[PDB]
Amino acid sequence: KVFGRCELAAAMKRHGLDNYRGYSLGNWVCAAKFESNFNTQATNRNTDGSTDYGILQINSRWWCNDGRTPGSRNLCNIPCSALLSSDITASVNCAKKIVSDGNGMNAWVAWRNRCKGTDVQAWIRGCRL
């Protein structure tokens, strides 16, 4: 499913993402936008052979198992296809572990390069939530 900005903002808030680990809502919406274009079905193949999945583009080398990425550690113990679902729960739950990893939202390159230090608030403005 392709989300709307506010539709995604509400779902993330309800799933407990607002200010999770210090990262306000605007950060998560901004990141989803540049990582997957609000598309739960997005996938991207990387050079090392792993693939990124879902709205938050969670990587198959450490976080999920896709049965084709060697050295796959599967930290959120879940098949990667569970992350392409229209119900963002699994992506949200796994996202929480990645952000608690110690590296913060720097784990998301699009966040680092396009959201870090911008008016991330603009992402949830005009939304009811």
What is the domain-level CATH number for residue 2? 1.10.530.10
- Which residues fall in the annotated binding site for substrate? 101
Alpha helices in the chain (DSSP H): 5-14, 25-36, 89-100, 109-114
The method of structure determination was X-ray
* Local structure of residue 82 (DSSP, 8 states): G
Nearest to 89 by CA among 116, 55, 121: 55
The closest alpha carbon to 21, from 96, 125, 87, 73, belongs to 96
Question: Sign of dihedral through CA atoms 84, 89, 117, 21?
Answer: negative
Nearest to 36 by CA among 17, 14, 55, 18: 55
d(CA 21, CA 42): 25
- Report the domain count for the chain: 1
Give the whole-angstrom CA distance, residue 28 versus residue 48: 26
> What is residue 30's three-state secondary structure?
helix
Residues annotated as catalytic are 35, 52
Q: Is the dihedral of CA 24, 10, 12, 43 positive or negative?
A: negative
Largest CA distance in the chain: 44
Classify the phi-psi angles of 104: left when phi > 0, otherwise alpha if psi is within -120 to 50, otherwise beta: left
Q: What range does the domain containing 126 cover?
A: 1-129
